[PDB]
Short mmCIF file of C-alpha atoms and ligand atoms in Angstrom, two decimals:
data_model
loop_
_atom_site.label_atom_id
_atom_site.label_comp_id
_atom_site.label_asym_id
_atom_site.label_seq_id
_atom_site.Cartn_x
_atom_site.Cartn_y
_atom_site.Cartn_z
CA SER A 2 -116.99 56.81 9.94
CA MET A 3 -115.97 59.28 12.04
CA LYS A 4 -114.39 63.03 10.91
CA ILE A 5 -111.66 64.22 12.83
CA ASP A 6 -109.62 67.50 12.29
CA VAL A 7 -106.48 69.06 13.42
CA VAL A 8 -105.39 72.67 13.36
CA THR A 9 -101.87 73.76 13.63
CA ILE A 10 -99.11 76.01 13.89
CA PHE A 11 -96.97 72.90 12.31
CA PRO A 12 -99.00 70.62 9.95
CA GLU A 13 -95.96 68.51 9.00
CA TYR A 14 -95.62 67.23 12.87
CA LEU A 15 -99.35 65.21 12.57
CA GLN A 16 -97.51 63.08 9.97
CA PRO A 17 -96.89 60.05 11.97
CA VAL A 18 -100.52 59.47 12.11
CA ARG A 19 -100.37 57.93 8.51
CA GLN A 20 -98.44 55.39 10.59
CA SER A 21 -99.48 51.82 12.44
CA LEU A 22 -103.08 51.84 14.04
CA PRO A 23 -104.21 55.11 12.80
CA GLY A 24 -103.05 54.66 9.35
CA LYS A 25 -104.49 51.13 8.91
CA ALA A 26 -107.43 52.88 10.73
CA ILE A 27 -107.54 55.86 7.78
CA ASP A 28 -106.96 53.42 4.60
CA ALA A 29 -110.33 50.97 5.94
CA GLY A 30 -112.36 54.39 5.92
CA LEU A 31 -113.01 53.99 9.06
CA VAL A 32 -111.22 57.69 9.67
CA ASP A 33 -110.94 60.16 7.54
CA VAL A 34 -108.38 62.69 9.01
CA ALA A 35 -107.64 66.26 8.27
CA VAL A 36 -104.85 68.61 9.43
CA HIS A 37 -105.11 72.75 8.93
CA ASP A 38 -102.48 74.75 9.35
CA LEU A 39 -103.19 77.88 11.58
CA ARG A 40 -102.18 80.25 9.84
CA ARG A 41 -104.46 79.96 6.62
CA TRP A 42 -107.00 81.82 8.55
CA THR A 43 -104.63 85.20 9.44
CA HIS A 44 -105.04 88.45 6.90
CA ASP A 45 -101.50 90.01 7.76
CA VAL A 46 -98.08 89.69 6.08
CA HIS A 47 -96.42 88.29 9.08
CA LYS A 48 -98.92 85.95 9.56
CA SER A 49 -99.35 86.51 13.62
CA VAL A 50 -100.98 83.86 15.90
CA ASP A 51 -99.69 85.41 18.88
CA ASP A 52 -99.19 88.34 21.41
CA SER A 53 -98.10 89.16 24.40
CA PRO A 54 -100.56 88.08 27.82
CA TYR A 55 -102.62 90.67 29.54
CA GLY A 56 -102.10 91.11 32.87
CA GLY A 57 -97.87 90.19 32.55
CA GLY A 58 -96.25 86.80 32.19
CA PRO A 59 -93.72 85.36 30.40
CA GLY A 60 -94.03 84.19 26.84
CA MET A 61 -97.11 84.27 24.19
CA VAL A 62 -101.00 83.75 24.24
CA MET A 63 -102.31 82.55 20.59
CA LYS A 64 -104.42 85.33 19.36
CA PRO A 65 -108.43 84.12 19.42
CA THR A 66 -109.31 86.10 16.24
CA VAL A 67 -107.45 83.27 14.19
CA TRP A 68 -108.67 80.41 16.00
CA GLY A 69 -111.99 81.75 16.16
CA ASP A 70 -112.01 82.30 12.02
CA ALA A 71 -110.62 78.95 11.85
CA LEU A 72 -113.36 77.38 14.39
CA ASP A 73 -116.03 79.06 12.60
CA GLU A 74 -115.44 77.10 9.70
CA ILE A 75 -114.08 73.68 10.41
CA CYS A 76 -116.68 73.54 13.75
CA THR A 77 -120.39 72.30 13.20
CA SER A 78 -123.13 72.27 16.23
CA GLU A 79 -122.45 68.53 16.15
CA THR A 80 -118.67 68.74 16.66
CA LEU A 81 -116.82 68.16 19.76
CA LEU A 82 -114.20 70.65 20.07
CA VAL A 83 -110.93 68.84 21.85
CA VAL A 84 -108.27 71.00 23.55
CA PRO A 85 -105.42 69.50 24.83
CA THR A 86 -103.79 71.40 28.11
CA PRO A 87 -101.89 70.63 31.34
CA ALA A 88 -104.67 72.59 33.08
CA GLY A 89 -107.11 70.51 30.74
CA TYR A 90 -109.82 67.38 32.85
CA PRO A 91 -107.51 64.28 32.50
CA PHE A 92 -107.68 62.53 29.19
CA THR A 93 -108.76 58.32 30.44
CA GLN A 94 -109.39 55.27 28.91
CA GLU A 95 -113.14 56.32 29.46
CA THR A 96 -113.19 59.31 27.70
CA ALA A 97 -111.65 57.27 24.81
CA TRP A 98 -114.30 54.88 24.66
CA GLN A 99 -116.79 58.21 24.88
CA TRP A 100 -114.99 59.87 22.27
CA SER A 101 -115.14 56.67 19.97
CA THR A 102 -119.00 56.98 19.29
CA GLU A 103 -118.45 60.51 17.87
CA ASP A 104 -118.93 61.91 14.61
CA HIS A 105 -117.00 64.69 14.58
CA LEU A 106 -113.74 65.59 16.56
CA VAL A 107 -111.57 68.89 16.10
CA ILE A 108 -108.40 69.38 17.95
CA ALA A 109 -107.21 72.53 19.00
CA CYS A 110 -103.34 72.20 18.67
CA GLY A 111 -101.98 75.20 21.49
CA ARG A 112 -98.15 76.68 21.18
CA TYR A 113 -96.57 79.03 23.22
CA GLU A 114 -98.07 79.68 26.48
CA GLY A 115 -101.70 78.66 25.68
CA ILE A 116 -104.66 79.85 23.69
CA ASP A 117 -106.77 82.82 24.61
CA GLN A 118 -109.57 81.22 26.94
CA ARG A 119 -112.67 83.48 25.32
CA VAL A 120 -112.02 80.82 22.08
CA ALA A 121 -113.43 77.66 24.12
CA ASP A 122 -115.64 80.36 25.91
CA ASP A 123 -117.21 81.58 22.65
CA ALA A 124 -116.75 78.28 21.16
CA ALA A 125 -118.88 76.67 23.93
CA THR A 126 -121.78 79.11 23.04
CA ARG A 127 -122.48 76.53 19.96
CA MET A 128 -120.66 73.25 20.22
CA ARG A 129 -119.57 70.85 23.05
CA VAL A 130 -115.84 71.77 24.35
CA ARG A 131 -113.35 69.52 26.53
CA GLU A 132 -109.97 70.59 27.56
CA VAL A 133 -108.02 68.31 28.39
CA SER A 134 -104.63 66.71 29.51
CA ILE A 135 -103.28 63.98 28.74
CA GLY A 136 -100.96 63.14 32.17
CA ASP A 137 -98.93 65.33 34.27
CA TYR A 138 -95.91 66.52 32.65
CA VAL A 139 -95.64 69.52 30.03
CA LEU A 140 -95.32 68.95 26.38
CA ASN A 141 -94.21 71.90 23.94
CA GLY A 142 -97.38 72.12 22.44
CA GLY A 143 -100.48 69.93 21.70
CA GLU A 144 -99.58 68.12 18.45
CA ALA A 145 -97.83 65.16 20.52
CA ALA A 146 -101.37 65.52 22.80
CA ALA A 147 -103.57 64.72 19.30
CA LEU A 148 -101.73 61.82 18.29
CA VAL A 149 -102.08 60.88 21.80
CA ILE A 150 -105.47 61.27 21.72
CA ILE A 151 -106.26 59.76 18.82
CA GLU A 152 -104.58 56.68 18.72
CA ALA A 153 -106.21 56.05 22.09
CA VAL A 154 -109.51 56.69 20.39
CA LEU A 155 -109.82 54.67 16.94
CA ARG A 156 -108.38 51.20 18.74
CA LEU A 157 -111.83 51.83 20.28
CA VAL A 158 -114.04 52.28 16.94
CA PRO A 159 -116.50 49.70 15.31
CA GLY A 160 -114.42 48.38 12.43
CA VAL A 161 -111.26 48.47 14.05
CA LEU A 162 -111.23 45.28 15.62
CA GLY A 163 -113.88 46.68 18.62
CA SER A 179 -108.82 48.78 36.76
CA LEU A 180 -105.75 46.83 37.09
CA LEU A 181 -102.45 46.41 35.23
CA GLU A 182 -101.42 43.17 33.13
CA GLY A 183 -98.78 40.85 34.25
CA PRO A 184 -95.84 39.96 31.95
CA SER A 185 -96.05 38.49 28.90
CA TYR A 186 -93.96 35.50 27.04
CA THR A 187 -93.41 34.10 24.21
CA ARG A 188 -91.04 31.77 22.23
CA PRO A 189 -87.94 30.06 23.47
CA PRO A 190 -88.99 28.57 26.53
CA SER A 191 -85.71 29.49 27.97
CA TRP A 192 -83.24 31.88 27.30
CA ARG A 193 -80.25 33.76 28.52
CA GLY A 194 -80.53 30.93 31.13
CA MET A 195 -84.07 32.79 32.00
CA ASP A 196 -86.99 30.40 32.09
CA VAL A 197 -90.76 30.94 31.28
CA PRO A 198 -92.38 30.57 34.36
CA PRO A 199 -93.47 26.63 33.76
CA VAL A 200 -97.24 27.13 34.79
CA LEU A 201 -97.52 28.91 31.32
CA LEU A 202 -95.92 26.03 29.80
CA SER A 203 -98.48 23.49 32.08
CA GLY A 204 -101.31 23.85 29.75
CA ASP A 205 -104.27 24.49 32.94
CA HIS A 206 -105.87 26.83 32.29
CA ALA A 207 -107.66 27.25 35.53
CA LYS A 208 -104.01 27.72 37.03
CA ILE A 209 -102.80 29.91 34.28
CA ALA A 210 -105.75 32.58 34.65
CA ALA A 211 -104.75 32.12 38.76
CA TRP A 212 -101.29 33.36 38.26
CA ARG A 213 -102.30 35.60 35.60
CA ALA A 214 -104.91 37.58 38.22
CA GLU A 215 -102.09 37.61 40.93
CA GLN A 216 -99.36 38.62 38.84
CA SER A 217 -101.67 41.87 37.71
CA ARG A 218 -102.78 42.70 41.37
CA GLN A 219 -98.65 42.45 42.38
CA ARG A 220 -97.81 44.62 39.62
CA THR A 221 -100.83 46.89 40.37
CA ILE A 222 -100.22 47.36 44.48
CA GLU A 223 -95.82 48.12 42.99
CA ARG A 224 -96.57 50.18 40.59
CA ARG A 225 -99.86 51.68 40.60
CA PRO A 226 -101.02 51.49 44.10
CA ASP A 227 -104.01 54.28 43.42
CA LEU A 228 -105.66 52.43 41.08
CA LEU A 229 -106.28 49.80 43.81
CA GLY A 230 -107.56 52.52 46.35
CA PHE A 231 -103.59 53.25 48.51
CA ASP A 232 -102.14 56.48 48.75
CA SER A 233 -98.93 57.33 46.33
CA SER N 2 -75.19 66.43 25.54
CA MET N 3 -77.97 63.54 25.43
CA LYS N 4 -78.38 60.72 22.80
CA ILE N 5 -81.68 59.52 22.41
CA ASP N 6 -81.86 56.04 20.51
CA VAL N 7 -85.53 55.19 19.38
CA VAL N 8 -85.97 51.37 18.08
CA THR N 9 -88.95 50.52 16.49
CA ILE N 10 -90.95 49.17 13.80
CA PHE N 11 -92.05 52.29 12.58
CA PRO N 12 -89.22 54.08 11.70
CA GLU N 13 -91.01 56.85 10.17
CA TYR N 14 -92.98 57.75 13.03
CA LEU N 15 -90.32 59.64 14.35
CA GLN N 16 -88.92 61.71 11.99
CA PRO N 17 -91.15 64.34 12.29
CA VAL N 18 -89.82 64.93 16.32
CA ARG N 19 -86.11 64.55 14.69
CA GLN N 20 -86.75 67.18 12.16
CA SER N 21 -87.76 69.40 14.79
CA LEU N 22 -84.52 70.05 16.07
CA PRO N 23 -82.99 72.95 16.24
CA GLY N 24 -79.79 73.50 14.10
CA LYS N 25 -77.62 75.18 16.50
CA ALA N 26 -78.30 72.40 19.24
CA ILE N 27 -76.93 69.58 16.91
CA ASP N 28 -74.44 71.73 15.61
CA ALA N 29 -73.03 72.35 19.21
CA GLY N 30 -73.50 68.88 19.71
CA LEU N 31 -75.82 69.19 22.38
CA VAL N 32 -78.54 66.12 21.04
CA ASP N 33 -78.78 63.69 19.14
CA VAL N 34 -81.88 61.13 18.32
CA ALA N 35 -81.32 58.37 16.53
CA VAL N 36 -84.09 55.82 15.50
CA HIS N 37 -83.78 52.24 14.26
CA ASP N 38 -85.83 49.67 12.31
CA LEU N 39 -86.09 47.01 14.91
CA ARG N 40 -86.45 44.44 11.91
CA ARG N 41 -82.93 44.92 11.10
CA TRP N 42 -82.35 42.23 14.23
CA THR N 43 -84.46 39.74 13.19
CA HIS N 44 -83.28 36.30 12.30
CA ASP N 45 -85.09 34.75 9.46
CA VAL N 46 -86.83 35.52 5.98
CA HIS N 47 -90.29 36.75 7.00
CA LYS N 48 -88.33 39.55 9.32
CA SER N 49 -90.41 38.08 12.60
CA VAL N 50 -90.81 40.56 15.45
CA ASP N 51 -93.55 38.99 17.55
CA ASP N 52 -94.68 35.35 18.51
CA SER N 53 -98.01 33.92 20.04
CA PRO N 54 -98.04 34.28 24.17
CA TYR N 55 -97.34 31.42 26.24
CA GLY N 56 -100.28 30.47 28.56
CA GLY N 57 -102.64 31.30 25.27
CA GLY N 58 -104.63 34.92 24.76
CA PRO N 59 -105.29 37.45 22.00
CA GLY N 60 -103.00 39.39 20.55
CA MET N 61 -98.67 38.53 19.96
CA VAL N 62 -96.01 38.95 22.04
CA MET N 63 -92.57 40.81 21.03
CA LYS N 64 -89.87 37.74 20.49
CA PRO N 65 -86.94 38.34 22.92
CA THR N 66 -84.35 37.05 20.54
CA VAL N 67 -84.88 40.06 18.45
CA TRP N 68 -85.37 42.83 21.05
CA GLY N 69 -82.14 41.16 22.87
CA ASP N 70 -79.83 41.88 19.67
CA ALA N 71 -80.91 45.06 19.27
CA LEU N 72 -80.57 46.25 22.75
CA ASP N 73 -77.13 44.61 23.33
CA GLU N 74 -76.07 46.58 19.93
CA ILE N 75 -77.53 50.15 21.22
CA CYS N 76 -77.12 50.08 24.40
CA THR N 77 -74.11 50.26 26.98
CA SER N 78 -73.68 50.61 30.97
CA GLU N 79 -74.21 54.01 31.03
CA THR N 80 -77.82 53.75 29.07
CA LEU N 81 -81.27 54.56 30.72
CA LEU N 82 -83.42 51.77 28.94
CA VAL N 83 -86.91 53.44 28.33
CA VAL N 84 -89.58 51.26 27.70
CA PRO N 85 -93.24 52.87 27.47
CA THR N 86 -95.94 50.39 28.85
CA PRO N 87 -99.59 50.79 30.07
CA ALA N 88 -98.41 48.68 33.10
CA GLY N 89 -96.14 51.22 33.57
CA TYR N 90 -95.04 53.51 36.55
CA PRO N 91 -95.97 56.82 35.78
CA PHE N 92 -94.09 59.00 33.71
CA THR N 93 -94.72 62.85 35.29
CA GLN N 94 -92.88 66.18 35.18
CA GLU N 95 -90.64 64.34 37.44
CA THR N 96 -89.38 62.17 35.70
CA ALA N 97 -89.01 64.51 32.68
CA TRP N 98 -86.58 66.67 34.99
CA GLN N 99 -84.89 63.19 36.44
CA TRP N 100 -83.94 62.42 32.93
CA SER N 101 -82.92 65.12 31.51
CA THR N 102 -79.68 65.25 32.68
CA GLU N 103 -79.17 61.51 31.09
CA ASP N 104 -76.39 60.86 28.81
CA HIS N 105 -77.71 58.71 26.92
CA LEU N 106 -81.62 57.31 26.64
CA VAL N 107 -82.43 54.25 24.40
CA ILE N 108 -86.87 53.88 24.21
CA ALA N 109 -88.18 50.20 23.35
CA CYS N 110 -90.85 51.21 21.52
CA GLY N 111 -93.46 47.74 21.30
CA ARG N 112 -97.17 46.93 21.04
CA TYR N 113 -99.28 47.00 23.53
CA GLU N 114 -99.56 43.42 24.20
CA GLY N 115 -95.79 43.08 25.44
CA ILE N 116 -92.34 42.63 25.16
CA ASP N 117 -91.49 39.32 26.49
CA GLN N 118 -90.70 40.09 30.63
CA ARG N 119 -87.08 38.33 30.05
CA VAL N 120 -85.55 41.56 27.45
CA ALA N 121 -86.31 43.71 30.22
CA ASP N 122 -85.35 41.86 33.30
CA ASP N 123 -82.31 40.54 31.53
CA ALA N 124 -81.27 44.06 30.54
CA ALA N 125 -82.07 45.15 34.05
CA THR N 126 -78.96 43.11 35.07
CA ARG N 127 -76.30 45.54 32.80
CA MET N 128 -77.90 49.15 32.73
CA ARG N 129 -80.48 50.91 34.31
CA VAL N 130 -84.07 50.15 32.90
CA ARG N 131 -87.51 52.24 33.26
CA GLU N 132 -90.97 50.85 32.66
CA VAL N 133 -93.19 53.89 32.47
CA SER N 134 -96.80 54.49 31.65
CA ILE N 135 -97.43 57.96 30.32
CA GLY N 136 -101.09 58.23 31.01
CA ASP N 137 -104.48 56.18 32.10
CA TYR N 138 -105.49 55.36 28.75
CA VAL N 139 -104.53 52.59 25.72
CA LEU N 140 -102.65 52.71 22.91
CA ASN N 141 -101.66 50.71 20.53
CA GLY N 142 -98.11 51.02 20.26
CA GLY N 143 -94.73 52.93 22.41
CA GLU N 144 -94.16 55.15 19.52
CA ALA N 145 -96.93 58.06 20.24
CA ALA N 146 -95.49 57.65 24.27
CA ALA N 147 -91.88 57.50 22.73
CA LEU N 148 -92.86 61.05 21.24
CA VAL N 149 -94.37 62.07 24.54
CA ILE N 150 -91.07 61.13 26.48
CA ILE N 151 -89.16 63.11 23.79
CA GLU N 152 -90.72 66.23 23.81
CA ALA N 153 -91.05 66.43 27.81
CA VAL N 154 -87.17 65.52 28.51
CA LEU N 155 -85.61 67.56 25.40
CA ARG N 156 -87.85 70.84 26.49
CA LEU N 157 -86.12 70.45 29.95
CA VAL N 158 -82.26 70.23 28.11
CA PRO N 159 -80.82 74.48 27.39
CA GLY N 160 -81.06 74.98 24.39
CA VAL N 161 -82.74 72.18 22.54
CA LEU N 162 -86.55 72.50 22.50
CA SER N 179 -99.21 71.99 43.37
CA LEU N 180 -102.59 74.19 41.28
CA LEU N 181 -103.33 74.40 37.76
CA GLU N 182 -102.46 77.55 35.80
CA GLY N 183 -105.65 80.09 34.89
CA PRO N 184 -107.39 81.69 32.06
CA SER N 185 -105.05 83.29 29.55
CA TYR N 186 -105.53 86.44 27.41
CA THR N 187 -104.14 88.86 24.70
CA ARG N 188 -105.90 91.36 22.52
CA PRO N 189 -108.28 92.65 21.69
CA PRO N 190 -109.49 94.01 24.52
CA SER N 191 -113.16 92.91 23.74
CA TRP N 192 -114.06 89.84 20.98
CA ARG N 193 -116.95 88.35 20.33
CA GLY N 194 -118.74 90.28 23.94
CA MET N 195 -115.99 88.75 25.91
CA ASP N 196 -113.83 91.40 27.66
CA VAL N 197 -110.51 90.73 28.95
CA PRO N 198 -110.54 90.88 32.67
CA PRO N 199 -110.25 94.68 33.77
CA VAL N 200 -108.07 93.73 36.73
CA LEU N 201 -105.40 92.32 34.33
CA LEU N 202 -104.96 95.72 32.77
CA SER N 203 -105.23 97.71 36.41
CA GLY N 204 -100.98 97.95 36.42
CA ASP N 205 -101.55 96.49 40.42
CA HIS N 206 -99.76 94.06 40.11
CA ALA N 207 -99.63 92.31 43.48
CA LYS N 208 -103.69 92.16 43.04
CA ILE N 209 -103.21 90.97 39.55
CA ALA N 210 -101.64 87.87 41.18
CA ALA N 211 -104.05 87.26 43.88
CA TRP N 212 -107.02 87.65 40.89
CA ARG N 213 -104.56 84.60 39.42
CA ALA N 214 -104.21 82.62 42.16
CA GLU N 215 -107.82 82.56 42.85
CA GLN N 216 -108.46 81.82 39.32
CA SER N 217 -106.08 78.78 40.06
CA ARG N 218 -107.76 77.49 43.09
CA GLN N 219 -110.98 77.33 41.63
CA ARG N 220 -109.70 75.78 37.93
CA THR N 221 -108.09 72.82 40.11
CA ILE N 222 -110.80 72.59 42.40
CA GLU N 223 -113.06 72.15 39.51
CA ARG N 224 -110.79 69.71 36.99
CA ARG N 225 -108.96 68.28 39.20
CA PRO N 226 -109.30 67.79 43.11
CA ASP N 227 -107.36 65.08 43.27
CA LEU N 228 -104.65 67.70 43.26
CA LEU N 229 -105.34 69.39 46.48
N1 LIG P 301 -101.00 66.73 29.56
C1 LIG P 301 -99.95 68.10 28.43
C2 LIG P 301 -100.77 68.65 27.52
C3 LIG P 301 -100.21 69.85 27.09
C4 LIG P 301 -99.71 70.70 26.15
C5 LIG P 301 -101.00 71.20 25.38
C6 LIG P 301 -100.70 71.99 24.66
C7 LIG P 301 -99.19 72.54 24.91
S1 LIG P 301 -98.08 71.73 26.11
N2 LIG P 301 -98.90 69.10 27.64
N3 LIG P 301 -99.31 68.16 28.92
N1 LIG P 302 -100.04 54.79 29.30
C1 LIG P 302 -99.51 54.17 28.02
C2 LIG P 302 -98.85 53.52 27.38
C3 LIG P 302 -98.66 53.11 26.58
C4 LIG P 302 -98.43 52.19 25.89
C5 LIG P 302 -99.24 50.73 24.72
C6 LIG P 302 -97.97 50.16 24.04
C7 LIG P 302 -96.65 50.67 24.22
S1 LIG P 302 -96.64 51.58 25.52
N2 LIG P 302 -100.43 53.00 26.26
N3 LIG P 302 -100.69 53.68 27.40
#
């Protein structure tokens, strides 16, 4: 059993976690996902979670005080605190395997132009903290990244069932709009099919992801 | 104006991003995001969307006859067909910028084992098709990837939504024994810029040496 807490100023945005694979994991009791409104830990009437940056620059920064109070309540020393950010360490399949073994993930979703760095620095004095990027593009907030991380991790947890690129796949009918399934796939020859598939995999990889094979671009 | 159509067997997945669109943008007709249940285009009483893979193996492959009908109805010659797949070309910020000026994106969400490759191959004879990955990890389905692509693209459309950035700070100046770096309070803005550049350099070396 795993616990995932998500902290966000847009809790309704995390509703998709109830769909598809994460939803099935929740229904099967293999994970408990709880979503928390960060504004619950404010004390002013405006419920302000952001302020202008020290040193200048555009936009706003999330205040450390509100985050600190929230994480104080939700986290323990055993918690793995996950903070999505474009400036993070890369989240990869290896990360997903690693986090699939964790008892408690807390995902802190940032908005505006980022979270005051002292939040992560303070948390690291009590627990493990991982600032991570899910890809080289910029989101509007950490919530979509949270959904990506949760799905990539949960599909690996024991009980939710259990390199190179996969090549093309096909199913019935064997001919469609004048396009035929590769004959080898219809031949029933396991060795020849395995060989064709291995080849298609390496060919797609050099075209789409040459970096995976140690080439430029 | 941009139109985005998403096709999925989990249409409820995309409802929060639809609701997040500012009313002013919709009213001005700058953006429209529509979601379609793939099962609308199934042929049988069981509403089948997938079938066993040719050549054997685990899992299921999504049916070309169903996807073919759905894309026939939804796409036009002007469409950029986006197909999230773990085996895709990398989706990056450059991609997001390119797609932000498109008139019509259609995103086909499928299971990770794939859509029959003839769907993309056939579509590519009539429109532009882009098979893309959003990172080096595997999801079970394309819906989360669709959410990421929609967000990254629409925040670059006006009025809708190198080195790493270094740390940011705001009030209070001291918190839990940690002070904001005094240089940021110095009023020496050339020095602040130099300090930030060094912070960015160090952070990039530590977290993303690949970028250097
Ligand atoms: N990889 C990545 C993370 C993010 C964000 C996290 C929080 C706000 S934006 N964008 N792209
Ligand atoms: N980067 C990436 C894409 C995916 C998908 C899985 C299923 C459809 S798209 N996983 N990882």
